[PDB]
Amino acid sequence: HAGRTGYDNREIVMKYIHYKLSQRGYEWDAGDDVEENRTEAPEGTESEVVHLALRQAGDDFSRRYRGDFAEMSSQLHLTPFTARGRFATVVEELFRDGVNWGRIVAFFEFGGVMCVESVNREMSPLVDNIALWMTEYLNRHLHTWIQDNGGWDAFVELYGPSMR
């Protein structure tokens, strides 16, 4: 019914990478794309379990396979003039066969691997372009399916705990 209640698409993608990257400690902060983080007011109650879950599913799933994705990142080259194109291919195959929650969570973890790889090879700035590209596809093609499957509310409930 149209309505309105965005879930911070830009914050959802950046948040995921912020955590997956934090594992190393390398202070990213997106990239001078935010003076401070006070503007946000203590409210919403619509993205407290969706993130926790989405962030969990990635590990619970990515760890389940441990065969592709992570190591699969070796295929792609390594540079700002590479991730761009390759990104399209990698993602293309991700949802090549219909889109689904589990498939989405996989798309996230993937982007996180490519990013960390940049800062590893002295390509920190590359991590910025990554988070961006991902965000795009997220709202571009994923948006349609997102609401189709039930929207964030569907995600949170799907991979969300049991009253916690």
Asked if residue 93 lies in contact with residue 76, where contact means CB atoms within 8 angstroms, the answer is no
The CATH number given to whatever domain includes residue 112 is 1.10.437.10
Q: Considering just the CA atoms, what is the radius of gyration of the chain in Å?
A: 16
State the residue range of the domain holding 9. 1-164
Domain count, the chain: 1
How is the chain split among helix, strand and coil, in percent rounded to 5?
65, 0, 35
H or E stretch including 3? none
Residue 114, burial from CB neighbour count under 10 angstroms (0-12, 13-18, 19+): buried
Q: Which residue, among 58, 59, 43, has the nearest Cα to 8 in the 3D structure?
A: 43
Give, to the nearest 10 degrees, the angle between helix 9-22 and helix 50-65. 50
First to last CA, the chain: 29
Q: Please count the other Cβ atoms lying within 10 Å of the Cβ belonging to residue 87.
A: 20
